[PDB]
Amino acid sequence: AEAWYNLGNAYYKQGDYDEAIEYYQKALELDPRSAEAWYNLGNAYYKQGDYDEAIEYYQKALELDPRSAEAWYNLGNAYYKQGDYDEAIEYYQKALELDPRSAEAWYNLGNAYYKQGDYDEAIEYYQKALELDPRS
């Protein structure tokens, strides 16, 4: 499983996402408990703009490792890309539970409320993002 997974990563690093997907799937066929293989398979589909597959595979990663702030944040991003702003808020909130000092998560939480027309909530979360990164 380790050699298929790292072959997938060597493709992913070059932006060869079709091949990354092929080889991550071979890794998972052999070891389906690898949170990291599911998460990176999700990432390869995300990079291709296939958000339905990204969401499916991030959800599997997070079943195996619910302490992955990165998987929560990227699941929020995949739902944001689909215009599902309440699910973006749901998963950004989980990422911030695990890393309250993530300027990126505060900012994207702000952008989900902005897309809903809740501009005062957006202001609140952009203010938190700027408390952490005043040069953004």
Cβ-contact 44, 17 below 8 angstroms? yes
Q: Which stretch binds Cl ion (CB under 5 A): 2-10, 42-50, 84-92, 123-131?
A: 84-92
The span from the first CA to the last CA of the chain, in angstroms, equals: 40
Q: Which is nearer to Cl ion, 17 or 73 (CB)?
A: 73
- The encoded tokens of residue 24 equal 């991550």
Burial class, 3, CB count within 10 angstroms (exposed 0-12 / middle 13-18 / buried 19+): exposed
Contacting residue, 35, 103, 130, 132, with Cl ion by CB under 5 A: 35
39 scored as a contact of Cl ion (CB under 5 A): yes
Q: Which stretch binds Cl ion (CB under 5 A): 14-22, 44-52, 55-63, 125-133?
A: 55-63
Give me the residue label for tokens 């990432």: 43
- C-alpha 51/C-alpha 45 separation (Å) is 7
| Minimum distance of Cl ion from residue 125's CB (angstroms) | 9
As a whole number of angstroms, the longest Cα–Cα distance in the chain is 49
86 scored as a contact of Cl ion (CB under 5 A): yes
Q: Which is nearer to Cl ion, 62 or 122 (CB)?
A: 62
Contacting residue, 59, 90, 103, 124, with Cl ion by CB under 5 A: 59
- The encoded tokens of residue 119 equal 């501009």
Which residues of the shown chain bind Cl ion in the complex (CB under 5 A)?
Answer: 35, 39, 59, 62, 68, 85-86
